[PDB]
Design a protein around this ligand. Structure first.
Ligand SMILES: Nc1nc2nc(C(=O)NCc3ccco3)cnc2c(=O)[nH]1
Length: 258
């Protein structure tokens, strides 16, 4: 017995198989017994035992390649992955984090830490493309699984590896964080399209920590100051209250209760 594993395959994927997956991911990220204003909070990192810190997400595609992402339950971040006999980790932000990841993928023959960190800014630079120009859907996802798998063999240039991370992160972590983003992926899957996320998706992604804070500091759901988001067409609008976000955000990073 070792960290909980959730499986998804792109082979034959449907909106139901993808929804089932994202639902199970959420269920492993949190027990759900800390909820504020109806929105679940992930476990506080302060004092969480290592043995509860991570979840694994096994990704397969029609080429029958498989990779396994490791996600930090405290924030749903993808911290690294394993493909066959190697495992690779983003460069950690602190020594505590560096220490935690020593506990993942312990039986793998080859382990490495990238010199670069895993935030979108760094990955975009590495990919040489912005999330607004990187396509999402089942096609991109199956392609990103192969790219990640092939990375040890030397088959995959770094820019492509970084694009593939940006895809996985959005289709897995962001979809888990936001029902809105899950729905965005369901739509691409339903119509078998691939398309870049629009400003509504990108600004929600960028605002996740800020939303977690606003809702958690709110006066019974009313934000202490407004949060600006973006519509599909890039126009700015303001959110004042948690009520509107209940069908949009599914999970928040822990902040202490005011
Ligand atoms: N590896 C990884 N990287 C991630 N990077 C981001 C990301 O940059 N967010 C933008 C941001 C705004 C403020 C601070 O930061 C989000 N999720 C993830 C994530 O879930 N896994």
């Amino acid at each position: 017995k070792q960290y909980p594993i959730i499986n998804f395959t792109t082979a034959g994927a449907t909106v139901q198989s993808y929804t089932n997956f994202i639902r199970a991911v959420r269920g492993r990220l949190t027990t759900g017994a800390d909820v504020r204003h109806e929105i679940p909070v992930l476990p506080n990192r302060v004092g969480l035992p290592i043995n509860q810190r991570f979840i694994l997400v096994e990704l397969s595609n029609h080429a029958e390649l498989s990779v396994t992402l490791a996600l930090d339950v405290t924030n749903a971040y993808v911290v690294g992955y394993r493909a066959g006999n190697s495992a690779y980790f983003f460069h950690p932000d602190n020594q505590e984090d560096a220490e935690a990841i020593t506990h993942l993928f312990t039986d793998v023959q080859n382990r490495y830490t990238f010199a670069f960190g895993g935030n979108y800014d760094r990955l975009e630079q590495l990919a040489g493309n912005l999330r607004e120009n990187i396509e999402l859907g089942n096609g991109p996802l199956e392609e990103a699984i192969s790219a990640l798998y092939y990375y040890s063999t030397g088959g995959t240039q770094l820019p492509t590896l970084a694009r593939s991370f940006i895809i996985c992160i959005q289709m897995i972590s962001e979809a888990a964080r936001f029902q809105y983003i899950e729905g965005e992926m369901r739509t691409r899957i339903r119509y078998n399209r691939r398309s870049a996320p629009d400003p509504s998706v990108i600004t929600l992604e960028n605002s996740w920590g800020r939303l977690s804070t606003a809702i958690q500091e709110s006066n019974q759901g009313a934000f202490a100051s407004p949060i600006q988001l973006q519509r599909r067409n890039g126009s700015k609008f303001s959110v004042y209250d948690v009520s509107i976000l209940i069908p949009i955000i599914a999970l928040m990073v822990y902040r202490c209760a005011p």
